[PDB]
Structure 1
Amino acid sequence: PAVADKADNAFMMICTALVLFMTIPGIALFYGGLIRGKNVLSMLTQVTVTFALVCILWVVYGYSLAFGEGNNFFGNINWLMLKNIELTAVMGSIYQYIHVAFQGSFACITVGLIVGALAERIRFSAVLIFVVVWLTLSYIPIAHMVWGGGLLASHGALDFAGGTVVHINAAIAGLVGAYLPHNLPMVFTGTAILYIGWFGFNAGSAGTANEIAALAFVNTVVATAAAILGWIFGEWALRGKPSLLGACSGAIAGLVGVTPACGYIGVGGALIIGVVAGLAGLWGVTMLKDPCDVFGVFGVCGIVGCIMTGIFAASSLGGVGFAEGVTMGHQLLVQLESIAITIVWSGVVAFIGYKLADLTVGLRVP
């Protein structure tokens, strides 16, 4: 039976720490420098406590429902508190305990994306209720559908590190929320930590320290750089000069955009995706006419990256190639469907979360 490779174990445990670093303190500092000074402490507390919450719900039943075998939409409850998972159990080429952790850290950053932006306007108890409802009914099923052998994966959707599961999912939850900068060095510091942590996020998604991890690593460097330049150029063009926030936004734009594509594309596709994503991101926030503008970058770039993954995975364009019997035509259709499903699923669940919270403790911070 399958034996764990210590090199992959090492890599994946370090990658998980890097993803945890994206939340604690990555996203917290990113939002901290953007929101009003008088709201920072509170937001920092909300991100820390909800992070703890997600970690616990993950171990208690999150992992089992997301990654256990079940149906197209959710797993099972046979892994409650990781029961039935032998310590030496192997998943892929690493111990399953590591997969649990790595996957849990993706749940954390996703929630951090939402809470950091909404902390200012939402009541503490309301956010806890929302987190519980949305992690359970949206994050878990979508993670199951994309990486848990569910509906989307079973139809061949390409999403290496979560353009759907993380970015689009959270962008929509945050935008439903919105519908209902004092420290730029701080924003930069959080952007930097997100960037560095993102190497575990993207490369670690290979599940092994192989050539695919190497590819995702290089593409991340390339798409992020291309997006910083694309954004900055659009900014110099529209506003006459680049800005620090523009540069950070650009980096996030490329990072988000390359997320679903990193392990399937060539460096050439990474450069193109990065440029398009930096520009689309700028167009995005511009059109979005607020820290919630952030969901404009995550949502627009997540959609763009997911669609472009269906183009650039082509052998012809330097990608690793589409699956057997799959054309670019067919693949693009599947990407569009995965995006639509994600937008609607997250939107509805988010609307139910906020509404439930509003009905139980009241949303609007007292």
Structure 2
Amino acid sequence: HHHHHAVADKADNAFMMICTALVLFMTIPGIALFYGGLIRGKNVLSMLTQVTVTFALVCILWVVYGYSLAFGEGNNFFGNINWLMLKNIELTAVMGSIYQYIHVAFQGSFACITVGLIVGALAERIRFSAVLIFVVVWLTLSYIPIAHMVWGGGLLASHGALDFAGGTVVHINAAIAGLVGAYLIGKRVGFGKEAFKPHNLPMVFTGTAILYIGWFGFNAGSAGTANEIAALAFVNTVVATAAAILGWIFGEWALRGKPSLLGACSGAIAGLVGVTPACGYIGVGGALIIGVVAGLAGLWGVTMLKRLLRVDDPCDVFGVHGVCGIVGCIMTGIFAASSLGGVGFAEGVTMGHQLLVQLESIAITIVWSGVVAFIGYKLADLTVGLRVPEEQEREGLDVNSHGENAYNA
């Protein structure tokens, strides 16, 4: 019955379009404000321009070939060239229970936020044009294949990996790209002898809040439909985030003597990341435990680990998205079990076997993103050069790279 086709469910269509909008909200302006507030005032505009321009860029590349290479059918590594500029995709084509045009938008938003997250490890000293070049190389060679292996019925998917909303695809992928970038460009001038306070902490809270709200479309949207799985992911996001806020806050209160707003904000993201690959698979109790752990792991992430790595990763992209991403991906393989409140594993899969797969997914993501990120930053350094000279770094990227001043009369 070859001419048979699926029909779209208007509820799922609406749900998914609102989710796409919520996910784009995370980048515009979520992550931009978040990172914007963390860095100094003389560079805030460079952060906003990097997120806005990389966003635009990712959108265009996505619809020209990106979606097609990640989601079309091919092999275990990447899709096909049949959906160039969405050609061959009928406006009425259905993907699951939604019009495929919606699927294209939803997945494209995940590509945007992932690239946005990366940008916070290069802040205050990277050349604007260098970022653009990197994005084109990294998205094309790293994001697309990874998205295809996990969510495009590719390699990792075929091995039963458990990543509900992007522990590997989004978080771990970006964290490594960032860690690599911060290492290559080097420490900011004055690092270790000069004070580097965030210029606007209300702006940081604002971005955090937007990120959290937008994350509902990120996690629940990953269900593909407004069903019971969507609701599970919703509740888990509420729990894990609250748990992580308390984990970080109390950990910081006990160790440093004070509960800070940054602590609270950081905690919120830490839980969100931690629960990203688990929200759709775990029970409410798993979300709590995962949350607490994620919060304390992110705390250790930006303190001890940052000091061990000797990296100047200004917005602690790795300390949070990498660490909590890995913690979450591992903990999913535990709390997905039936006897622990989870939805259970696939037919004939033990816990020991699932954990090995999770570690395999973490290893392949860290490894691929890292090498690809290297080629990108090098391509950028051969053509434009990655770092702005020291004196531009002092005056600020805002007037030197973007010819504008953030706050005036």
What range describes the TM-score normalised by the shorter chain of this pair? Answer: over 0.9
* Most deviating of 288-297 and 215-224: 288-297
Deviations 1:233-264 (A, max 9, x none): 11011101110000000000000000000000
Contact 2:118 2:317 in 1 (8 A): no
Corresponding residue number in structure 2 for 1:43: 47
Residue 36 of structure 1, CA deviation: 1.1
Deviations 1:23-68 (A, max 9, x none): 0000000001001110011221111111000000000000000001
Residue 116 of structure 1, CA deviation: 3.7
Deviations 1:251-309 (A, max 9, x none): 00000000000000000000000000000110111123352423210000000000000
Contact 1:47 1:116 in 2 (8 A): no
Residue 127 of structure 1, CA deviation: 0.5
Contact 1:31 1:291 in 2 (8 A): no
Structure 2, unpaired ranges of 5+ = 1-5, 185-197, 307-312, 390-409
Contact 1:114 1:173 in 2 (8 A): yes
Corresponding residue number in structure 2 for 1:294: 317
1:116 paired residue among 120, 144, 160: 120
Give me the whole-angstrom Cα distance separating, in 2, the residues matched to 1:55 and 1:202. Answer: 21
Corresponding residue number in structure 2 for 1:351: 374
Please state which structure has a larger fraction of its residues in helix: 1
Contact 1:168 1:302 in 2 (8 A): yes
Deviations 1:314-333 (A, max 9, x none): 00000000000001110000
Contact 2:121 2:179 in 1 (8 A): no
The 1:116/1:285 distance shift into structure 2, 3 A limit, reads closer
Contact 2:120 2:317 in 1 (8 A): no
* Most deviating of 288-297 and 183-192: 288-297
Residue 122 of structure 1, CA deviation: 1.2
Contact 1:312 1:318 in 2 (8 A): yes
Aligned length: 365
Give me the whole-angstrom Cα distance separating, in 2, the residues matched to 1:343 and 1:292. Answer: 19
Give me the whole-angstrom Cα distance separating, in 1, the residues matched to 2:74 and 2:123. Answer: 34
Corresponding residue number in structure 1 for 2:384: 361
Give me the whole-angstrom Cα distance separating, in 2, the residues matched to 1:291 and 1:14. Answer: 32
Residue 119 of structure 1, CA deviation: 4.0
Residue 76 of structure 1, CA deviation: 0.8
Structure 1, unpaired ranges of 5+ = none
Residue 115 of structure 1, CA deviation: 1.8
SS state at 1:306 partner: helix
Runs of 4+ in 1 over 6 A off after TM superposition: none
Residue 230 of structure 1, CA deviation: 0.5
Larger radius of gyration: 2
Contact 2:30 2:207 in 1 (8 A): yes
Residue 71 of structure 1, CA deviation: 1.0
Give me the whole-angstrom Cα distance separating, in 2, the residues matched to 1:196 and 1:267. Answer: 19
Contact 2:32 2:48 in 1 (8 A): yes
Deviations 1:176-226 (A, max 9, x none): 001011111000000000000000000000000000000000000000000
TM-score relative to the length of structure 2: 0.88
> What is the root-mean-square deviation in Å for CA atoms of aligned residues?
0.8
Contact 1:254 1:273 in 2 (8 A): yes
Give me the whole-angstrom Cα distance separating, in 2, the residues matched to 1:365 and 1:9. Answer: 46
Contact 2:39 2:123 in 1 (8 A): no
TM-score relative to the length of structure 1: 0.99
Corresponding residue number in structure 1 for 2:397: none
